[PDB]
Design a protein around this motif. Structure first.
Motif, PDB file in Angstrom:
ATOM      1  N   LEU B 229      18.234  39.267   2.555  1.00  0.00           N
ATOM      2  CA  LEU B 229      18.389  40.700   2.801  1.00  0.00           C
ATOM      3  C   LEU B 229      19.834  41.188   2.784  1.00  0.00           C
ATOM      4  N   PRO B 230      20.811  40.524   3.429  1.00  0.00           N
ATOM      5  CA  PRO B 230      22.194  41.018   3.313  1.00  0.00           C
ATOM      6  C   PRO B 230      22.697  41.069   1.883  1.00  0.00           C
ATOM      7  N   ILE B 233      21.109  44.168   0.215  1.00  0.00           N
ATOM      8  CA  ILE B 233      21.798  45.370   0.675  1.00  0.00           C
ATOM      9  C   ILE B 233      23.147  45.500  -0.020  1.00  0.00           C
ATOM     10  N   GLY B 234      23.890  44.393  -0.104  1.00  0.00           N
ATOM     11  CA  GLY B 234      25.191  44.427  -0.746  1.00  0.00           C
ATOM     12  C   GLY B 234      25.122  44.784  -2.217  1.00  0.00           C
ATOM     13  N   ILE B 237      24.185  48.454  -2.688  1.00  0.00           N
ATOM     14  CA  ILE B 237      25.365  49.280  -2.449  1.00  0.00           C
ATOM     15  C   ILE B 237      26.337  49.168  -3.619  1.00  0.00           C
ATOM     16  N   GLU B 251      38.947  49.948  -2.319  1.00  0.00           N
ATOM     17  CA  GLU B 251      38.896  49.015  -1.198  1.00  0.00           C
ATOM     18  C   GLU B 251      37.462  48.768  -0.753  1.00  0.00           C
ATOM     19  N   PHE B 252      36.633  49.815  -0.744  1.00  0.00           N
ATOM     20  CA  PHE B 252      35.225  49.625  -0.412  1.00  0.00           C
ATOM     21  C   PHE B 252      34.527  48.765  -1.454  1.00  0.00           C
ATOM     22  N   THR B 255      35.466  45.236  -0.753  1.00  0.00           N
ATOM     23  CA  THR B 255      34.733  44.772   0.421  1.00  0.00           C
ATOM     24  C   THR B 255      33.285  44.449   0.074  1.00  0.00           C
ATOM     25  N   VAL B 256      32.660  45.288  -0.752  1.00  0.00           N
ATOM     26  CA  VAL B 256      31.285  45.047  -1.179  1.00  0.00           C
ATOM     27  C   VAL B 256      31.196  43.766  -1.995  1.00  0.00           C
ATOM     28  N   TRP B 259      31.453  40.860   0.346  1.00  0.00           N
ATOM     29  CA  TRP B 259      30.171  40.768   1.034  1.00  0.00           C
ATOM     30  C   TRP B 259      29.126  40.108   0.150  1.00  0.00           C
TER      31      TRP B 259
ATOM     32  N   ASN C  11      35.654  49.755   6.074  1.00  0.00           N
ATOM     33  CA  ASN C  11      34.965  49.616   4.783  1.00  0.00           C
ATOM     34  C   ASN C  11      33.912  48.541   5.002  1.00  0.00           C
ATOM     35  N   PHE C  12      34.028  47.763   6.068  1.00  0.00           N
ATOM     36  CA  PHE C  12      32.989  46.765   6.390  1.00  0.00           C
ATOM     37  C   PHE C  12      31.870  47.461   7.119  1.00  0.00           C
ATOM     38  N   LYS C  14      30.622  50.477   6.791  1.00  0.00           N
ATOM     39  CA  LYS C  14      29.862  50.920   5.611  1.00  0.00           C
ATOM     40  C   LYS C  14      29.677  49.476   5.220  1.00  0.00           C
ATOM     41  N   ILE C  15      28.614  49.015   4.575  1.00  0.00           N
ATOM     42  CA  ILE C  15      28.190  47.595   4.302  1.00  0.00           C
ATOM     43  C   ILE C  15      28.098  46.712   5.541  1.00  0.00           C
ATOM     44  N   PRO C  18      24.804  49.896   7.342  1.00  0.00           N
ATOM     45  CA  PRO C  18      23.696  49.906   6.350  1.00  0.00           C
ATOM     46  C   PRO C  18      22.854  48.626   6.334  1.00  0.00           C
ATOM     47  N   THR C  19      23.417  47.431   6.515  1.00  0.00           N
ATOM     48  CA  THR C  19      22.672  46.178   6.593  1.00  0.00           C
ATOM     49  C   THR C  19      21.915  46.065   7.910  1.00  0.00           C
ATOM     50  N   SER C  22      19.090  48.481   7.829  1.00  0.00           N
ATOM     51  CA  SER C  22      18.014  48.059   6.941  1.00  0.00           C
ATOM     52  C   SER C  22      17.189  46.941   7.559  1.00  0.00           C
ATOM     53  N   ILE C  23      17.846  45.983   8.217  1.00  0.00           N
ATOM     54  CA  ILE C  23      17.116  44.931   8.920  1.00  0.00           C
ATOM     55  C   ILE C  23      16.240  45.541  10.004  1.00  0.00           C
ATOM     56  N   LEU C  26      13.264  47.526   8.345  1.00  0.00           N
ATOM     57  CA  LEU C  26      12.182  46.657   7.895  1.00  0.00           C
ATOM     58  C   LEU C  26      11.407  46.095   9.077  1.00  0.00           C
ATOM     59  N   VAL C  75      26.827  54.664   4.369  1.00  0.00           N
ATOM     60  CA  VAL C  75      27.534  54.419   3.110  1.00  0.00           C
ATOM     61  C   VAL C  75      28.163  55.702   2.591  1.00  0.00           C
TER      62      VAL C  75
END
Lengths: 281, 281, 281, 281
Positions: B229-230, B233-234, B237, B251-252, B255-256, B259, C11-12, C14-15, C18-19, C22-23, C26, C75
């Motif tokens: 799941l993480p 999501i990553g 995004i 930068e985002f 980071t994504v 992740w 920036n983490f 965000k990501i 959202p994770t 989402s967990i 669900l 996000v």
């Protein structure tokens, strides 16, 4: 092209590694001394696995005696001179190789007890009372010669760093490959082969769950190798860095050294998990 | 308009990802080889779920064969070859989709075994014996075609990047949507419809023993989807970033990407949790 | 005057938010839908606490329906509009207050079932069938009037922020203090009093038969308040900052806000621990 | 010369109040419930339960003052000199009384197992008359420096409350006294008692190796595991103040931060006695 020539260990290692070393020292002293008292002084070693875990407890006690020297050399650096640096390094090496050789011997004992359950009771006695010494302690003592030779203290930048000092970097690579080999691969290959054959011969033992003395030793060996695996990955990457194969920046060569430091401190928890599987089963 | 620069993987990741890959490599090789030996070579499969779990073990073993290439790529970019990059990506895709389709087939097996416990012994047998190939492996091998077409080693400077290099950015987005869909949504919707109709026919009934073989299936599927799941999501995004819909800066995006790398390495633990449930349940 | 610049989410976060969302989405949909299906629509509720836990599942399902909007606002920002911002905030407040008031009703029900074991079976039924609505949902639907009044989407810069926009900061302080009161203190005092009297009347007897049944509700309430405690610490400290009482830094009102964000995301797991206790009965 | 330590970070101004509040809630509820059930509903059955009643009284006394720690962590000490003295006195009383009670628990268990026949008057003497003179009189005698040196120092804007000594050698000698009579001497006594217990319980045939010496072992091990990182940190700080550990001035700040967080985390010992009454382990 020299890298950073090591960095001053992050100020937090120097309070964390001392903390990890002290926790492992306390647990190792208490637990391994209690195992030696119960299973090796009062002679209630029932199974032949409890004979080998006595050897593990002796090796781990020897290492945790010197663990406070590791803590002091973490906070400050070495004050204790050259002879005691040699003693600490050879005791560390004796523990390093004896513990994993003992685990290989417990795997061999389980293989002889399960697979050859009818005729291997006499080989299981020699392997645990006469052959264990020449197959564990003599190889472990013969591998401290590089630490009887190269483990000196370098009076340096007001540092006095107790470490194995080699004539060149190829010696470092060779001895790190030797550590990886005879501490992870060959004992690991022997343990994996023994346990694969055990599972293949136990899978059709009617179903009757002979996972008794097997589960304890499986947990012991799996926990030992789980403790040691990140350190071995770190030193394999470091050895390939020294061999000019990982030609990345010096900051990577410093973060791999930091990885080695914390993962080696965290790998000393193997000295604590032998008594832990006596608290639990 | 600002095409960003993927900042190279944090030196940490370059030692973390090999460590995670090596832990998964050892655990997956040992566990899946032991399952294929016991359940697949010695015929100790005692239910219809164990056949699908043998399929999981085969797929996971196939992936963890290539995991050392993943670890080397995490350290040293790529010096194996374009053909080996294609093979690694093909096996990665095969594991990715075959494992989730096998989990969906396990959910159908449980649905037929619980909701239709009086007329489903032949369609379950027919499913697990013949339809599993057509519905798991044919989708896994005919949807790995974009790896045969696109997965190649771009020699960007000294960084030989082994990845799927699509002609257009929209292709990257549409294939990430494809992966999200047929790896999380459609099999996930199928698995939840089959387990919500079981939860509802296991209450309206009050059943038991089957109830209990339903636990080892729920834990397996839940652990798989919790691992993945993480990462999903990553990458969702990242896909919405790459459509110029999110637009939170470079930068985002970096980071994504970090992740995605970390949580893809952590999501490979799904190759370890099939045999772990054979070691606990 | 320094307005204290409110940096944007990391920036983490965000990501990550959202994770987490989402967990929780669900798990909340699946678990709360299954609870409403089985212990609700299928009328498998049999314990008079399952009625209140059905109420919890209704509230938690209503909240996790709006959780995807929380992930998107994590996000990107609020592209859904003023009315749907109001609806999401109203549902958030209804969940916030109804869940804790339902836990207070669970504690009061256990108090009546244990302390007043003989007399309170009809007061318990009245409490769970008629009083529960006017004591949980009506207070929760009357505390959401400030969301119907103030929650609005502000087009500041390109950030459409969806939050409760008050005239002054004193309004923020008073509506955070009433949040702390009605969500932690008054229901917490009621729950603590009920369970202290329960223990003083279980431990003054051989209470062992009803020191379960009680265990599930104790675990539920403790897990709820453990989830919500870091958030309440953060928002109390933020309320004292907004009163210029703490008046520390401007980096401490962005550390106390990135804490509030993280701990509010992590406090939404309360919507998942009511169905999870049905897995761990 | 002084590092110049002036920062409590910003996380440790919201994390530490959070930890203090979690421990305040858990300690208040659990220790009040123990004192009510044990010290008021005399449900003290054992002689460990009387010492654990003493622990609950001490921990309740400390968690009364814990809100002052929570305020001093985010704000500073605006309570006054008398309240600074009272909080420090109660902190010292808890610090020494709890570990001396655990030493008495170890000695009571030593008399219970080792001298099983002729120890029912000594174990009733210790738990009823000697516990006061050996725990509470010493804990109220080592709080004299908290009456003499604990004062709120206005210094800068922040009125800091701490125990302020004339020299830095007094800080060292009192930190060494802390380490000794809080870790070493009670720890040596506990280790000696439990090692002799193990040497006697082992020989005993079928002496359940664990009996009820499980709950006391778990309690003491958890207490010392909570306190050990703090003791490592303050021993390192004490040798820093002796001009022995000269590793810079950022190391002193790292050590002080370690001390702050690990001291807050060491207050979980104030809730281990009730949590072991909630698990009966």
């Amino acid at each position: 092209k020299e890298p950073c020539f090591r960095e001053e260990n992050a100020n937090f290692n120097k309070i964390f590694l001392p903390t990890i070393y002290s926790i492992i020292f306390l647990t190792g002293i208490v637990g391994n001394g209690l195992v030696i008292l119960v299973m090796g002084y009062q002679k209630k070693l029932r199974s032949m696995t409890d004979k080998y875990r006595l050897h593990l407890s002796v090796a781990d006690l020897l290492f945790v005696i010197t663990l406070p020297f590791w803590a002091v050399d973490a906070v400050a650096n070495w004050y204790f001179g050259n002879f005691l640096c040699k003693a600490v390094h050879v005791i560390y090496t004796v523990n390093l190789y004896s513990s994993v050789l003992i685990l290989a011997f417990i795997s061999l004992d389980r293989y002889l007890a399960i697979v050859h359950a009818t005729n291997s009771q006499r080989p299981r006695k020699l392997l645990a009372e006469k052959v264990v010494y020449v197959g564990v302690w003599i190889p472990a003592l013969l591998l401290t010669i590089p630490d009887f030779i190269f483990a000196n203290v370098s009076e340096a930048d007001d540092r006095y760093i107790c470490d194995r000092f080699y004539p060149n970097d190829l010696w470092v690579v060779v001895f790190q490959f030797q550590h990886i080999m005879v501490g992870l691969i060959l004992p690991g290959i022997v343990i994996l082969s023994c346990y694969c054959i055990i599972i293949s011969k136990l899978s059709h033992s009617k179903g009757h769950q002979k996972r008794k003395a097997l589960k304890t030793t499986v947990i012991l060996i799996l926990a030992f190798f789980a403790c040691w695996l990140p350190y071995y990955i770190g030193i394999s990457i470091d050895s390939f860095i020294l061999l000019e194969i990982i030609k990345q920046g010096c900051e990577f060569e410093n973060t791999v050294h930091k990885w080695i430091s914390i993962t080696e401190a965290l790998a000393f928890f193997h000295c604590c998990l032998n008594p832990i599987l006596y608290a639990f089963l």
